[PDB]
Amino acid sequence: MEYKDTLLMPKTEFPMRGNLPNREPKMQEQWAEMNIYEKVQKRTEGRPLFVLHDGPPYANGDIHMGHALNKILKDFIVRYKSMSGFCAPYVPGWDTHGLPIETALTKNKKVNRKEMTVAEFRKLCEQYAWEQVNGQREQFKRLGVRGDWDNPYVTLQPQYEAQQIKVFGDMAKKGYIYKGLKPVYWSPSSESALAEAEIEYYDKRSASIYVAFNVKDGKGVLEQDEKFIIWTTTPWTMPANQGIAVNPELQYSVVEADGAKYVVATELIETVAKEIEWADYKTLRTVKGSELERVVAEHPIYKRDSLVVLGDHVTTDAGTGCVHTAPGHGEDDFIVGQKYGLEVLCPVDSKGHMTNEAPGFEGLFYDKANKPITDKLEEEGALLKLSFITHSYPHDWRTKKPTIFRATAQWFASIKDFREDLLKAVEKTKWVPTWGETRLYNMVRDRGDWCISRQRAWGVPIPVFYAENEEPIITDETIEHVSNLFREHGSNVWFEREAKDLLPEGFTHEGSPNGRFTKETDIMDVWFDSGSSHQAVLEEREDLQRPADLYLEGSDQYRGWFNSSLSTSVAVTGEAPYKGVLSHGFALDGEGRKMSKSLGNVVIPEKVMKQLGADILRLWVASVDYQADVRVSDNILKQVAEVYRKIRNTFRFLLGNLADFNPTTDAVAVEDLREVDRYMLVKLNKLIDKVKKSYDSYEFSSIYHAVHNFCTIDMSSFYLDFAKDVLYIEAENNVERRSIQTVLYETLLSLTKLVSPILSHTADEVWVHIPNVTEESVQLVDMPEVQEIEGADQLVEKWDAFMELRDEVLKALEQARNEKVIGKSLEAKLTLYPTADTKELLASISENVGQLFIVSDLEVAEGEAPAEAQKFSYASIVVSKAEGEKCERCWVVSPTVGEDQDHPTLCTRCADVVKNHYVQQ
Amino acid sequence: MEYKDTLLMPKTEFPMRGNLPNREPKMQEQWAEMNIYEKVQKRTEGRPLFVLHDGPPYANGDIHMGHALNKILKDFIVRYKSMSGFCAPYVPGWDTHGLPIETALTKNKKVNRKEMTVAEFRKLCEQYAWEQVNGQREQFKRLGVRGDWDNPYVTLQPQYEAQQIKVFGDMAKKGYIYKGLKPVYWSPSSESALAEAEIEYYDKRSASIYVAFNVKDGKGVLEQDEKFIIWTTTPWTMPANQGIAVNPELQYSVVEADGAKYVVATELIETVAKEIEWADYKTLRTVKGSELERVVAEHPIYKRDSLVVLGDHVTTDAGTGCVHTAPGHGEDDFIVGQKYGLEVLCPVDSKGHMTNEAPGFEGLFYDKANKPITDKLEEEGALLKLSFITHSYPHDWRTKKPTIFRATAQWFASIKDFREDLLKAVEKTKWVPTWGETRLYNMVRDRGDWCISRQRAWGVPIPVFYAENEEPIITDETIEHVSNLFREHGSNVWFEREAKDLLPEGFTHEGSPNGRFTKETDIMDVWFDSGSSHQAVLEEREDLQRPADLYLEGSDQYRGWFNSSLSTSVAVTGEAPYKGVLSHGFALDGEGRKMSKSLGNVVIPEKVMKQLGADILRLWVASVDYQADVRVSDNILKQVAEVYRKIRNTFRFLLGNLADFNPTTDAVAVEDLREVDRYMLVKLNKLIDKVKKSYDSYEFSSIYHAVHNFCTIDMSSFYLDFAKDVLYIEAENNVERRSIQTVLYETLLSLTKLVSPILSHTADEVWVHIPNVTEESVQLVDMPEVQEIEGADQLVEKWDAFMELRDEVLKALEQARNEKVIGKSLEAKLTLYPTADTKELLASISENVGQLFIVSDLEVAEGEAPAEAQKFSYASIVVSKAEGEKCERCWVVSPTVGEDQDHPTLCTRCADVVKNHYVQQ
Ligand SMILES: C/C(=C\C(=O)OCCCCCCCCC(=O)O)C[C@@H]1OC[C@H](C[C@@H]2O[C@H]2[C@@H](C)[C@H](C)O)[C@@H](O)[C@H]1O
Ligand SMILES: C/C(=C\C(=O)OCCCCCCCCC(=O)O)C[C@@H]1OC[C@H](C[C@@H]2O[C@H]2[C@@H](C)[C@H](C)O)[C@@H](O)[C@H]1O
Ligand SMILES: [Cl-]
Ligand SMILES: [Cl-]
Ligand SMILES: [Cl-]
Ligand SMILES: [Cl-]
Ligand code: NA
Ligand code: NA
Ligand code: NA
Ligand SMILES: [Zn+2]
Ligand SMILES: [Zn+2]
């Protein structure tokens, strides 16, 4: 069809389809060639600092959806702050110590820790961590996250290790760090101790046994015919037994059951009667618990003496009232054991095997030793009832294997001494979400003492020496000298040098007469490694500072990084390491379930960027309420990708219709342009404030919907459809067109900046094509600032009413189309019977209201109720087919067609345009 | 002949605009005359029984959103079951006994109880209660909820009271009912005892004091110059002190602080030192709490003995380690008080005023007595610290005024004697959400005995007689006789006649040799009234049975109706009253804040029904995940109205285009149906399966989204989009048109039946206009069943690919019109450059794909795609202007237009249709 060449069609090299999986890597390569992170940090050099301290992810395996969610949220804030008058350094980190690196390394080539020196094994661990760090670094940078990826912090760095030593020493000189014997969580699979924060409770099968302890010395309160009934679910602790615990205040009874005399707490007589399946049980004598103290009983197996002891831990809620007591396993057994001087017998190997202190079961795994023990109890007749019951049991954090209690000398951290200062730090830090304040406050007050000793090789050694008299040596001189050595040669010097070589020259200890010294071989828990980041990173580096403004990790870090960082920082500095905390939820599937490999519901970040691209994944992050748990799936991302497509088309339209627009000259003053064009500018400015405030308040979901509605409803539904009849049909320098292009140019420039934090790849793609831009990247400009328009309030009042009318005419047009009256709006004549208020609104409008409704004919009658034709709130509307022939250029139905023999198929406007602007009269 | 007169436009009496506020009442009047509930119950009288027992709402005021949510949720299940092969009797209830109704007549109306008897006053209470029942009944009926509204149950009914008396008697017979002197919640405003279910915790500002108790005799452990420090926020409990409670296994230290020696717990010394603001405090000695048992302390005011007592309840979490023990104002104080034989002193009366047992403070309100006590304490030199704090405090359920603890003789139900049976009953019940099992399991395990006696007038009497020896009389003979009298005369007979006339004719009790008897005046707890509804309704009504299938109430009923109904039912029957329980959350506003008259964020069902209609509110209930707290505002409902309009438009299209369709003659069998038509039937069968399975799982939001998507993307956007061309233009008996009408008629029947439980008003509105229908209402038919379609897997495999192709085609068409290439899809030629798979798909479709794309021309090219082509996954598409002339009838652009000289403006198809069917026969 002719006259198609006489239209000003959109023209832009910005493609309709982004092809993000193949385009984004080019953008990322171009960003790196720019050194964009250095450019932004140098442009904002003289700006108030905003420091978001990166929590160190563990350097093992590929990044999961939680890693992408965490890093993308951080990237949003750092990018926004870099464009809002702040200097926003970002130093990503990595946690590179602990058991997981050791276990993965061992089976990588079936290498063994016993075939290599500890120093050699650690060096391979360091190599493995660096390989994992590099893999995660390139995956993170594929997400589009900007940062100092070439100068990260890793916990294996000698400078990091040295600073961690100082943090340990400061807590040591303040009395917070102490050593002592205590039953602690132990993982036989890991052959090292654990902590309550490292223990998860899972259900397991256990043997519930009722054992009989026959009395040896009744001490005038019991006879020898009577026996004590203990109940335990851990038969492997029986070889460690040292006594029977009874509650002093509780009343105990002697029971005649099945021809035997049994001692059981009175309140649990019938409960035990059901369990042991007694027949005709009679109560003989009732006694008080304090009477039973120091009564001598006999161990069923070894026939040694068990001392009846008084303890509060005895409860009538579950059991027999008489509690088997072994100080080696169980803390409540230990406290009462030390009260009476009972021996701390712990006959379990570091690998879970019974040692020489358990005759008849030596060299057996404890779970495999339960049956020989229960059999031995039956042989002597001490076994009363055996029933297997499933119950909650402590388990290892990663190996998911059961953990037992062993009485071993470890190192601990006393939160109690400075617990008040922790509380003041909990309230002084802003918490988003708000309930996090209560979560950490209850954690601090209910906290016990933090065990910090691990019997592993890969980690930071405990910088403690021992003299000849076996006394711990922790002075400020020793801590400082160790820290300097770790700074110079790393933590491996602790395992390749003698203890005398790790102390200052000429070091003398009053407990060491011959100058002989020994060194601790334990290492710190990795929660101490990651918790010292505020000292080794925030305060060590020039580009950062302490406290950091923000700490952004998941909700699982209230027990971890949020807690460990506070404990060390308050201990050493007296204040919190963060000015505020932001917490996000976990990533779930579409069904709302946790992702697991067995179910196959895991969404891999690598596959999302291979199939959809990073920008979509970031747009998903902005679309969800991160502060609670979120969902993501193939269908959920497809919905986001459709939204991203709508936004991208909005950008392409702006660029396409600005191809002939010079912002330096062709721009129209806001006063001089039209009201409807000025109305869109006000809406743009309303959008600018909402997005910036939503960025400030960290409400990114609001940004997601605000831009989505602006692109779909405000721009494409009304303004872009309305602008087609001017941008395409009218002359290039038509005053109405230049006013439209001016609003489009303003909309394009501001919207590109607004979405730069989130759609980082697309924003720079749009930015290059924007006319009259003089910066390399949109990241190098500040956010748009709201401008107030003269008479904005009156302008909004008038045109908000017009939009109400426009919605009503749109419904009427849709109904008319459904009744086969018109195929499109241009084929329609709209006659309006309005209210007097509606009429005065239409008289105040100087624009072609028919063109604003995209119709060929608009009539406002003098006033007469029609024959029941589309009654609406503002007016009654009749939709008629327009009269005349259709112009072959703008497809309007007007009688003006054919009034000029030159171009006899065109209307007056289109004939003039070709005559005067393509032929020039 | 006008060409528009030759189009088969839709014709139906179903209005486009619902006008639900003005038309739903007419529907409800039509239901009322039908006796639709009676008809449904009779139609299904042989069907198996499903019982959803209605929880009785209090009849005091208008219904709120929680009520509307509850009933509509109940109405969903009862309606669905009645259509799913069950008999579903729904019997609404009302709780009519209670203090709020008693208070309203006393205060709001001009009723003085001096002028009338108690029985006459209760008659007024019944009259006021009935008015509220009638008011709520109409409001509930306006929601559209079906049920036996004309024969409901109320707690004041003589039969209801007769069975409640039976419940008391059976529990009393089993020994679960007793009268005892124990501390209970007491409301001074109501002058009555209370229960934790009738307690609301509010913030209260009280005075926090620290009081020194001098030591009278240290018994070799303490010294005469040493003192106990106690902490309390209730100074009015000081006159009732009897001793100092300590924890037997906590360590207590004698601390000399600012020239005074005090006894506090070791772990609380620093906390105490901060509150009293001690300057110099030193720990002198240390003893365990067990050693302090014999110590006798001095009461600060009255100088009487204060026995140090040992108690497990004494905690180190707040105040000092020493708690002042008043057995008459606390549960834990009473337990230890009985252990040591302490006097149960309650110097406060039922009106909250200090009695003579508190010399120096007699006649004062407890709040007004705190200041004199603290002043006297300071004058005696025992007040170490006075502070004012704000903390959560128990308040009255009705008056919203703070309560106190008073030791009084009340009636209790001993849960402890059958708590094992309750817990087993909880585990044999299904809970949705599942966590509701944990809530009741923990509540039953951790609860005390239930105080069931109230000192009010409006409620069921406690059916106990007392003899001359003042011993209680509860026998099966007396309980049945009272129950018979209550069934024939009502509960007022207890307040009208005397005790002798309330006993059996010949009654002999050894405790009344003279024959004189007395009757208890206390009434039952309103929770007992509601908690007996299983015996008083399910076992009494012959259309119901016990156990009920389902209890459906809010999350506030785990302590309320669910617990009390379980407690009475398990006591009397040994089983739970319900097979399963469904819990819903509370209704919030758009921001998620609780509704409040202060904020003005309350959504009133009465207004919603007057401005939007019940069906919108019913549609919102299905729209939310009711099993947790939900949100609703005017904007939220307006969003739901948009969804309703789409659904109503879908129904209006089906009715309009089935005007000429008679199923008896014009139906096309599935074998003779087209593939795309059978493909729609396959998708319809999938809708049937998911919707019915979602009703069975109580997952209504699934039905909400499934129906919305089916009407919008599967029907309005896809099937109805190309059905218009056949339906409006082709001949009436055209087989393609009949095939579409067959699918529409099948969908119209299934859709109306599926949505009947939710959009009840609109489903019956559509059902009347459905062609060739015999049943009076949609409620009187069963749900549609899923029928297999041959080749469904192959049908879905193909046409799903076609649907995805069409969406890409639609995206291409939308882009073309935005570039002024076309104005309408009918003005376009589609040129497709398909992939290899797409080429196969388009060859396997026997239908006119160009017709299915609503275009005038389609061309699948074999050449390379041009550079300007729109790239997509399935194909590269070029949208051009269709060649030819537009047909005046069907608006298609074909070269065949202008061939028929009899119809110069018609294409070949339209010209033949007019000539063979509209000009001729
Ligand atoms: C919300 C989270 C995971 C998630 O949402 O994961 C959901 C996706 C899991 C997919 C399943 C994986 C396959 C295994 C299976 O079978 O299940 C937790 C967050 O992770 C990111 C960050 C991890 C950093 O290391 C932590 C630092 C702070 C500490 C000092 O060490 C941190 O912010 C963390 O809190
Ligand atoms: C989910 C609920 C309220 C809600 O969601 O409230 C939302 C609306 C609150 C309106 C507040 C108005 C402003 C007040 C202000 O000023 O603050 C609670 C449920 O209610 C329905 C039913 C009530 C029946 O009587 C209960 C029975 C079972 C018992 C035996 O008596 C029951 O299911 C109940 O559990
Ligand atoms: Cl503004
Ligand atoms: Cl004219
Ligand atoms: Cl209760
Ligand atoms: Cl279920
Ligand atoms: Na600033
Ligand atoms: Na609008
Ligand atoms: Na209790
Ligand atoms: Zn024109
Ligand atoms: Zn035609």
Author numbering:
A (entry chain B), B (entry chain A): 1 to 921
Sentences from the paper on this structure:
Mupirocin, a clinically used natural antibiotic, inhibits isoleucyl-tRNA synthetase (IleRS), an enzyme that links isoleucine to its tRNAIle for protein synthesis. Two IleRSs, mupirocin-sensitive IleRS1 and resistant IleRS2, coexist in bacteria. Specifically, type 1 proteins (IleRS1) are strongly inhibited by mupirocin (Ki in low nanomolar range), while IleRS2, which are homologous to IleRSs from the eukaryote cytosol, exhibit resistance to mupirocin concentrations that are about three orders of magnitude higher. AARSs catalyze the formation of AA-tRNA in two steps within the same active site. The amino acid is first activated by ATP to form an aminoacyl-adenylate (AA-AMP) intermediate, followed by the transfer of the aminoacyl moiety to the tRNA.
